[PDB]
Amino acid sequence: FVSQTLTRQAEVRASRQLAKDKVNECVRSQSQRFGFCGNGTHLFSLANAAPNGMIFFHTVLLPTAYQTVTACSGICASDGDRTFGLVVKDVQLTLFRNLDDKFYLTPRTMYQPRAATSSDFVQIEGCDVLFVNATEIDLPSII
Amino acid sequence: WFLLTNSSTVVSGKLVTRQPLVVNCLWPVPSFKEAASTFCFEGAGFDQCNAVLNNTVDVIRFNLNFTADVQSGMGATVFSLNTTGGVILEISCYNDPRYCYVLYNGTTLKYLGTLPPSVKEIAISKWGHFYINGYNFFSTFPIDCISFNLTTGASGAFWTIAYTSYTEALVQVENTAIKKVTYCNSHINNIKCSQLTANLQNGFYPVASSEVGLVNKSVVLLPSFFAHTTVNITIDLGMKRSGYGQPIASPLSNITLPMQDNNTDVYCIRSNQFSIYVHSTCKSSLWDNVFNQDCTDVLEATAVIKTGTCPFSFDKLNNHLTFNKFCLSLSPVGANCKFDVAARTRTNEQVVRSLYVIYEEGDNIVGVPSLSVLHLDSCTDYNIYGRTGVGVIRQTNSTLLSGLYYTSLSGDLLGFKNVSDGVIYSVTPCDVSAQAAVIDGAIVGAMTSINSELLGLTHWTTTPNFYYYSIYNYTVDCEPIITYSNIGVCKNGALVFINVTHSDGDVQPISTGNVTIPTNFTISVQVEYIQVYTTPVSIDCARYVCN
Amino acid sequence: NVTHSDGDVQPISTGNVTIPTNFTISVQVEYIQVYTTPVSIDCARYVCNGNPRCNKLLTQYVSACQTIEQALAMGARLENMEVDSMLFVSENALKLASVEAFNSTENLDPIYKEWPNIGGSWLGGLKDILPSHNSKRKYRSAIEDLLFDKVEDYKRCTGGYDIADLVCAQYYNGIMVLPGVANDDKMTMYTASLAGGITLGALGGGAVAIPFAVAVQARLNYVALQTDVLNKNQQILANAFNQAIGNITQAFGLATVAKVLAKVQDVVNTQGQALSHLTVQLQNNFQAISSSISDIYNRLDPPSADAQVDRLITGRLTALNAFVSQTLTRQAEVRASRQLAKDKVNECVRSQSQRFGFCGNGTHLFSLANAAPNGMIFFHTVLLPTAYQTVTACSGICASDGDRTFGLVVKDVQLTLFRNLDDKFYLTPRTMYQPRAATSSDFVQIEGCDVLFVNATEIDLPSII
Amino acid sequence: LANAFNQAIGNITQAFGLATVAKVLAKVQDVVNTQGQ
Amino acid sequence: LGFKNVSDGVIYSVTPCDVSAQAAVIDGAIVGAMTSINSELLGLTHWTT
Amino acid sequence: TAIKKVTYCNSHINNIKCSQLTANLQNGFYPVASSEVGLVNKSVVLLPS
Amino acid sequence: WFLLTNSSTVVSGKLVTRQPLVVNCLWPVPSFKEAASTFCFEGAGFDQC
Ligand SMILES: *[C@@H]1O[C@H](CO)[C@@H](O[C@@H]2O[C@H](CO)[C@@H](O[C@@H]3O[C@H](CO)[C@@H](O)[C@H](O)[C@@H]3O)[C@H](O)[C@H]2NC(C)=O)[C@H](O)[C@H]1NC(C)=O
Ligand SMILES: *[C@@H]1O[C@H](CO)[C@@H](O[C@@H]2O[C@H](CO)[C@@H](O[C@@H]3O[C@H](CO)[C@@H](O)[C@H](O)[C@@H]3O)[C@H](O)[C@H]2NC(C)=O)[C@H](O)[C@H]1NC(C)=O
Ligand SMILES: *[C@@H]1O[C@H](CO)[C@@H](O[C@@H]2O[C@H](CO)[C@@H](O)[C@H](O)[C@H]2NC(C)=O)[C@H](O)[C@H]1NC(C)=O
Ligand SMILES: *[C@@H]1O[C@H](CO)[C@@H](O[C@@H]2O[C@H](CO)[C@@H](O)[C@H](O)[C@H]2NC(C)=O)[C@H](O)[C@H]1NC(C)=O
Ligand SMILES: *[C@@H]1O[C@H](CO)[C@@H](O[C@@H]2O[C@H](CO)[C@@H](O)[C@H](O)[C@H]2NC(C)=O)[C@H](O)[C@H]1NC(C)=O
Ligand SMILES: *[C@@H]1O[C@H](CO)[C@@H](O[C@@H]2O[C@H](CO)[C@@H](O)[C@H](O)[C@H]2NC(C)=O)[C@H](O)[C@H]1NC(C)=O
Ligand SMILES: *[C@@H]1O[C@H](CO)[C@@H](O[C@@H]2O[C@H](CO)[C@@H](O)[C@H](O)[C@H]2NC(C)=O)[C@H](O)[C@H]1NC(C)=O
Ligand SMILES: *[C@@H]1O[C@H](CO)[C@@H](O[C@@H]2O[C@H](CO)[C@@H](O)[C@H](O)[C@H]2NC(C)=O)[C@H](O)[C@H]1NC(C)=O
Ligand SMILES: *[C@@H]1O[C@H](CO)[C@@H](O[C@@H]2O[C@H](CO)[C@@H](O)[C@H](O)[C@H]2NC(C)=O)[C@H](O)[C@H]1NC(C)=O
Ligand SMILES: *[C@@H]1O[C@H](CO)[C@@H](O[C@@H]2O[C@H](CO)[C@@H](O)[C@H](O)[C@H]2NC(C)=O)[C@H](O)[C@H]1NC(C)=O
Ligand SMILES: *[C@@H]1O[C@H](CO)[C@@H](O[C@@H]2O[C@H](CO)[C@@H](O)[C@H](O)[C@H]2NC(C)=O)[C@H](O)[C@H]1NC(C)=O
Ligand SMILES: *[C@@H]1O[C@H](CO)[C@@H](O[C@@H]2O[C@H](CO)[C@@H](O)[C@H](O)[C@H]2NC(C)=O)[C@H](O)[C@H]1NC(C)=O
Ligand SMILES: *[C@@H]1O[C@H](CO)[C@@H](O[C@@H]2O[C@H](CO)[C@@H](O)[C@H](O)[C@H]2NC(C)=O)[C@H](O)[C@H]1NC(C)=O
Ligand SMILES: *[C@@H]1O[C@H](CO)[C@@H](O)[C@H](O)[C@H]1NC(C)=O
Ligand SMILES: *[C@@H]1O[C@H](CO)[C@@H](O)[C@H](O)[C@H]1NC(C)=O
Ligand SMILES: *[C@@H]1O[C@H](CO)[C@@H](O)[C@H](O)[C@H]1NC(C)=O
Ligand SMILES: *[C@@H]1O[C@H](CO)[C@@H](O)[C@H](O)[C@H]1NC(C)=O
Ligand SMILES: *[C@@H]1O[C@H](CO)[C@@H](O)[C@H](O)[C@H]1NC(C)=O
Ligand SMILES: *[C@@H]1O[C@H](CO)[C@@H](O)[C@H](O)[C@H]1NC(C)=O
Ligand SMILES: *[C@@H]1O[C@H](CO)[C@@H](O)[C@H](O)[C@H]1NC(C)=O
Ligand SMILES: *[C@@H]1O[C@H](CO)[C@@H](O)[C@H](O)[C@H]1NC(C)=O
Ligand SMILES: *[C@@H]1O[C@H](CO)[C@@H](O)[C@H](O)[C@H]1NC(C)=O
Ligand SMILES: *[C@@H]1O[C@H](CO)[C@@H](O)[C@H](O)[C@H]1NC(C)=O
Ligand SMILES: *[C@@H]1O[C@H](CO)[C@@H](O)[C@H](O)[C@H]1NC(C)=O
Ligand SMILES: *[C@@H]1O[C@H](CO)[C@@H](O)[C@H](O)[C@H]1NC(C)=O
Ligand SMILES: *[C@@H]1O[C@H](CO)[C@@H](O)[C@H](O)[C@H]1NC(C)=O
């Protein structure tokens, strides 16, 4: 009896650590661990008591449809005889060009676009083959 | 109604038990009627029935409030019992509270006690056991017929008499009372009894694919010379009466073995085959030990031999038990075990003598009932080179050069060789395990290895690793209720196979061409349980071990 | 001795510091168990081998069989649900997830017309990880075939065509091994889909692919923003990868490979022995004249035969209870390792983790996975530095305008500020030497200056304020 | 989002009195049964 | 646990004369105990419920 | 093979020490019997005859 | 050559067993020869090896 009891206590100790991590990362904070707080994009968690433990209610965002945009890997710009590239400073954002030919940035988790500005770009020495050529019309808003 | 027990009583809980809950006949008694009749177990009349099942009755139940209103037409006598010796016993209450006694000729044999003011049930089994409120308070000799004449008279109370038989059932008890009875009489009810559950949850349950009983016997033994001996053991029983009149079997009873080597004291099998019989002779005597009278009345006795300390029974020596040596003796010198020789009478069986056995396990000598009879392609009770069991024996086209027989890791026989031509036979079980698919309290199908009808299921289909029997009309696109792995079973018994969940896919960190960004959102709530703590138990070691 | 290393890079921006610069590829391999192989036991048949008389005695122990069967059935049910909720596929990813798909051009998006196929450079390694049609069984990778080669039907058990083998012999004793093939097939599709999705351009519809090298470059930008766009360092990483997989495939057919092989065979050996141990106990005559119930009933009359069978019944129920306890203990063990396997897929394969040291030893770039007996194999591809670049760091900049003095500090705590040979200010991430010129939006203006700050001059000011 | 949430909880509460609910109920009763036995 | 008197139907209960108890030991001495029986034990005379 | 310390099992606290094979108990809770018995009346109940 | 047993026969598997597998002498017999001799266990001739 004692051996079986001690074995189960070790088992539960491990599941307690998991319950504790779930409270601290899903309920008391906003976790950056993909897939941890349920299947989907985590929004918030609530909890209830249960016999010998607890119940977690993971509220997640579920997409029903996707928006297509035309993305750019970077922008190729020039001033006089000097050519250089501009790339997005924040690697988590997608750069795309709107119907107004203006540059926008959007996070990949939700279609929440904002106009791009100069502080969002990093200037580097060259341009890749997938870069889009900038014109005088765009330059004042991106440099 | 109460459960019948020989010892302690269950206050609450579910138990599978053998109880007289089958009703052959129910005889209700009106408020002002005399329940007077004569009942016999071995062929009841069944004329007063409220469905009637015509069979032998095991128990008669009197379900009435034996208050101070219940009177008998026989006066003091409540019951009159006709037992197997032609003997009449009476159960009677007197007012010198009503005190019940067991009587024979007019004198009292036992005092049972007074009747409690709270008696709701009396059951009399044919083996003489009397149950009051479920408890076996007293017993008599086996009963053939019970006479009774019971009435509540002017009280205007009603009651019933039930004629019942024993069966296995799952019974739910609460406060020492029956609340629910489920009979173990169907394919679904057998699962309920096995699971101690009157209401099964949806799922799969292990069952036997079939039952067996009544088979041919198959015997395979290595060839030898036919050399058969009949061994006639004669037992002369000495019977005398004791002061109470019951029989006593004398220690002076004699055992005579067949004669061997002039002397008789000892006898040995010196043949290849043999059969042993016991011939019973009875003589009676007075008290001077003069066994010159015939046995009659009660001093009638049959000589029988019991097992005693031997790893075999005397009566089974006529099967196909084998030995290298086997001797009987009337003197314990070299004996390996002994048999108990007894005088069996109408009731009591008592030991008079011991018979000593000397033996060595082996195969030179075989007992016989009067061989190599093998029954193929059918279920048989076999004895093959000393290995016994039940199964189906088939001829195979395999070849194994070495050995006589082959067994499994569990010790079971898997096959054997015919020494006359090298043919290999395989041996398989007549019945196998199967998984019954149970949905909403019914069997809708089953998983089996044998292509044979089971559990009342007649329709079937063949899948890659099993046969599936069902209620579904087999010669589906339905939702499964119960599932394991990729196998699901639908409400209508249909079997379906289950794929793996599909999704659109993960959004990748691509910013190079056309890309899709999740846009239109809703809410999904997922629920999970995690165990945090156990319920600790503190044990007092000394008290647990030493109460 | 104990392994030596150079040491961890610290968040120091105060003097001379070293930033990892010249990188190659290292591939680490690990095995995690996901599921056990469940066994369903027929209690009555195991204890009472089809004997109607033993079966009656056994009803006195009806609660013992109920507990044994319920415990095993519930364990298997819970495990089944846990696995079904873990494994899934994407139809488009699964279309791309094959060697033949990767070696073709037809599934590639037109803007990549300058690339011959998907992952051409990386194919020399991927070919042994991705599923192939020209393989054993169906749709498995070269490595999976090696693992499974190194390490079921019941219809045939009632045929009577030959003498039964070990599996049918166990079946006859009430021991059924539940199908695990489906879990093997599901795992193969699961891991293949995860790999295929790396190169899947969009989730709208259409197995439209991007190059593997393009997908890899995206992962490099998560490690550190890449500025040397004119430095085609990708061929080097691809070559190192292909060689690493070559050595791993050869090793299976490298300390990490030895560890995987040891763990995988221990899992199969444990399950085998645990169940064979159950069968040997049926030869045990628990102080009885025989271990065979049928032999007892053919030798003794019921008054004595039942006494002998009763000894076997209690002995066998005890052995059977021991089996169940061991089985349940292992299922709990595996449940814990399943959570780890699930976390590894979600954080190493399906996303870019920020947990240091989680996805192998080194700087994580990407992970691939394969199926294995009772679990899966993870291939952790990490960046391994061979040399470091020294820079002279500044803790901050001390600036002045007229009589007002103030400090400028770097807004992003993960970057090192250093001064170049041109006396210009640059910022670089500490994980890779990938410097960019500093600008005004990268600094925070604070009230004072520390003693470790560098004094700015009129030449720098226009670029940092 | 609020409406979708309210409906989801409605279905969960009803289910207790949804594969995730079935899993919770199975695990919770297994814990109490194991300790009892 | 109990029995019936066959003469009148009265039920009797049977309990242990002694039960397990938890002694509270601090710095080598018993300072109290947890018990189901309202009776002095271990030399302890004061109590609360 | 020499005696260094003897604790007698002659008190409520010393009985715990003997049971625990410990001459110096750590703070905590210990299972004990609430009482001892000895010297009692005999009670016999049998069915009438 | 076969393994010698008193009971059941092993179909497959590895076993540690005591068997007459040590060869003191091997006497081959030609296609047309009579293997006629007298053999004693307690001191064999061993002339045809
Ligand atoms: C209370 O205990 C007694 C003895 O321990 C049990 O007595 C036995 O009862 C069974 C079933 O009624 C009798 O079975 C019958 O055996 C004959 C063979 O002689 C067979 O031909 C019949 O078909 C039937 O199977 C058995 O003879 C009897 N033995 C006795 C009188 O000692 C009694 O069953 C137990 N009752 C309860 C409710 O627990
Ligand atoms: C088959 O079973 C028989 C009996 O169960 C075994 O018989 C025994 O065989 C052994 C080894 O050949 C004999 O050992 C010898 O014992 C003498 C002592 O008397 C000793 O001096 C010799 O050096 C040697 O150890 C033993 O006497 C013999 N006993 C008999 C004949 O019953 C037989 O070994 C088993 N054979 C196989 C293949 O399983
Ligand atoms: C997101 O949801 C909105 C609302 O349903 C969609 O907008 C509608 O789209 C249909 C079909 O083209 C039009 O007929 C309606 O007039 C639109 N409504 C409004 C208010 O604009 C939108 O298309 C969805 N977006 C995606 C990517 O699925
Ligand atoms: C059952 O008992 C009653 C007595 O309580 C029997 O009825 C009596 O029978 C005798 C003989 O014929 C008559 O002299 C009495 O006058 C009857 N008494 C009454 C009240 O009528 C009855 O016969 C018995 N039944 C059976 C089947 O024996
Ligand atoms: C073992 O094999 C032998 C040899 O084939 C079987 O003997 C034959 O049985 C057939 C069918 O009755 C007879 O017609 C032959 O004459 C028998 N041959 C001889 C030489 O007797 C034998 O029956 C098989 N043993 C069992 C138990 O089936
Ligand atoms: C994780 O959640 C996603 C939803 O975000 C599930 O994906 C959906 O699955 C259903 C099939 O049951 C499809 O009809 C939907 O079109 C899918 N939607 C999306 C956006 O993929 C996914 O199946 C869940 N994971 C598991 C293991 O069940
Ligand atoms: C991205 O998707 C759009 C579709 O919305 C593509 O646009 C079409 O391109 C073809 C070129 O053959 C034109 O003939 C069509 O008129 C375009 N418009 C529409 C509304 O379909 C676009 O080419 C795709 N581009 C990239 C880089 O992925
Ligand atoms: C983790 O990986 C690092 C490589 O990044 C290992 O460090 C190398 O170890 C070898 C000795 O086997 C040295 O010769 C190299 O110079 C080390 N390189 C660096 C950059 O430190 C490290 O040993 C690995 N960790 C463990 C536990 O083995
Ligand atoms: C950082 O390292 C450089 C070496 O690359 C040091 O530069 C040398 O400093 C000494 C000062 O005694 C000069 O004499 C040398 O000429 C310098 N140049 C070279 C190429 O060695 C520098 O001093 C170190 N500084 C800090 C703050 O760590
Ligand atoms: C990728 O496809 C090419 C063909 O386009 C394969 O190369 C051919 O391999 C066959 C042998 O099976 C040779 O007979 C041909 O001559 C080769 N052709 C060329 C152009 O090299 C190549 O092996 C495939 N690679 C993989 C990993 O499948
Ligand atoms: C195992 O890795 C080694 C590198 O450490 C591989 O050897 C290299 O092979 C390439 C050709 O593909 C040569 O150009 C290099 O010069 C070799 N380097 C060394 C140090 O030998 C080796 O081929 C790999 N093993 C397998 C099976 O691919
Ligand atoms: C990173 O690797 C490059 C290439 O090997 C190194 O650059 C070479 O360094 C040697 C030694 O000073 C010079 O002789 C070569 O001419 C350099 N090659 C080129 C193309 O510049 C570089 O020094 C390494 N950097 C570090 C920090 O180890
Ligand atoms: C379970 O969820 C469904 C939605 O999937 C709920 O049904 C909706 O109920 C609202 C009213 O509150 C209606 O306006 C919607 O049209 C319904 N939708 C569908 C598809 O039927 C359902 O009420 C929820 N169950 C519970 C108990 O709340
Ligand atoms: C940008 O301009 C150059 C000429 O300087 C041209 O070769 C290149 O193709 C242009 N890029 C794009 C995307 O059109
Ligand atoms: C008792 O039964 C016997 C039959 O065995 C019968 O001859 C006898 O008359 C019966 N006696 C009574 C009082 O019923
Ligand atoms: C009953 O007892 C009397 C005593 O007077 C005796 O004469 C008679 O024979 C006995 N009856 C039986 C059946 O033994
Ligand atoms: C005996 O064997 C025959 C086949 O020859 C079969 O038809 C019959 O049913 C069997 N009888 C029994 C009782 O098993
Ligand atoms: C045993 O008795 C029977 C019946 O009287 C007889 O047929 C048989 O021959 C006897 N056996 C011997 C050996 O006398
Ligand atoms: C048995 O034989 C003895 C003589 O040895 C004899 O006195 C006795 O009466 C016999 N017993 C029986 C029951 O025949
Ligand atoms: C016993 O057998 C012997 C021969 O061994 C014979 O001479 C003698 O007459 C026999 N005696 C009896 C009484 O059988
Ligand atoms: C035995 O017969 C079966 C047909 O039922 C056949 O498939 C199998 O190959 C045969 N085996 C041998 C050894 O002849
Ligand atoms: C099963 O389907 C066949 C084909 O339509 C039909 O003839 C048969 O009667 C059906 N059986 C039952 C039980 O419905
Ligand atoms: C998916 O399952 C459905 C039946 O539910 C079946 O029609 C279809 O062929 C299956 N597809 C796969 C991927 O096996
Ligand atoms: C490391 O091990 C080597 C031998 O492999 C030995 O020469 C050296 O002294 C050891 N150094 C340490 C740290 O013990
Ligand atoms: C910055 O200038 C001050 C004088 O205003 C001087 O004391 C200080 O040492 C200078 N800092 C550095 C790094 O030279
Ligand atoms: C016997 O019972 C009486 C109560 O009637 C009680 O006072 C007395 O102490 C008991 N004696 C013993 C030795 O238990």
Side-chain angles (χ1 to χ4, degrees), chain G residues 4-6 18-19:
Chain G
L4 306 187
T5 188
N6 273 322
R18 182 173 61 87
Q19 295 284 321

Side-chain angles (χ1 to χ4, degrees), chain A residues 17-72 74-78 80 83-94:
Chain A
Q17 184 67 54
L18 182 60
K20 186 173 180 180
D21 291 348
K22 288 279 175 69
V23 171
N24 288 340
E25 297 178 34
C26 304
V27 177
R28 296 174 70 195
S29 73
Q30 295 81 49
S31 177
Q32 297 180 73
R33 293 172 66 189
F34 179 82
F36 181 66
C37 301
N39 168 47
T41 296
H42 184 255
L43 185 63
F44 65 86
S45 294
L46 302 171
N48 276 180
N52 287 106
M54 69 181 88
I55 305 299
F56 292 87
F57 298 91
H58 299 295
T59 300
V60 302
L61 297 168
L62 190 151
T64 66
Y66 301 87
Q67 174 72 54
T68 300
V69 301
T70 299
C72 302
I75 296 167
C76 190
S78 181
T83 187
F84 59 88
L86 301 173
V87 299
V88 176
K89 192 180 293 193
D90 185 345
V91 74
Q92 295 183 36
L93 303 173
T94 297

Side-chain angles (χ1 to χ4, degrees), chain B residues 14 170-173 177-182 192 198-199:
Chain B
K14 295 181 178 71
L170 174 64
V171 181
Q172 182 179 329
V173 179
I178 297 167
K179 297 299 187 183
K180 185 173 176 68
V181 179
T182 297
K192 291 180 182 178
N199 297 92

Side-chain angles (χ1 to χ4, degrees), chain C residues 66-67 70-71 74 77-78 81-82 335, chain D residues 19 22-23 25-27 29-30 33-34 37:
Chain C
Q66 186 275 330
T67 298
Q70 181 179 28
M74 192 65 177
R77 178 179 287 200
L78 290 169
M81 290 190 290
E82 289 167 352
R335 185 176 65 248
Chain D
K23 184 180 176 188
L25 290 170
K27 186 64 166 72
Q29 73 184 14
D30 188 52
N33 287 150
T34 295
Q37 292 171 340

Side-chain angles (χ1 to χ4, degrees), chain B residues 313 409 433 449 501 504 506, chain C residues 42 89-90 171 283 299 350:
Chain B
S313 173
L409 179 60
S433 299
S449 66
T501 304
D504 293 347
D506 292 327
Chain C
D42 178 342
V89 301
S90 168
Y171 177 65
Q283 290 183 38
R299 291 174 70 93
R350 296 174 70 195

Side-chain angles (χ1 to χ4, degrees), chain B residues 200-210 212-213 215-231:
Chain B
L200 298 174
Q201 75 186 131
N202 294 341
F204 294 96
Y205 294 90
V207 298
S209 71
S210 68
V212 303
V215 298
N216 306 312
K217 292 190 176 184
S218 294
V219 178
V220 178
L221 297 169
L222 293 174
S224 183
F225 285 124
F226 180 77
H228 177 73
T229 294
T230 297
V231 182

Side-chain angles (χ1 to χ4, degrees), chain C residues 288-290 296 300 304-309 311-313:
Chain C
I289 64 171
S290 183
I296 292 167
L300 297 172
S304 297
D306 287 344
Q308 293 293 308
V309 172
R311 298 181 83 89
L312 294 175
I313 290 169

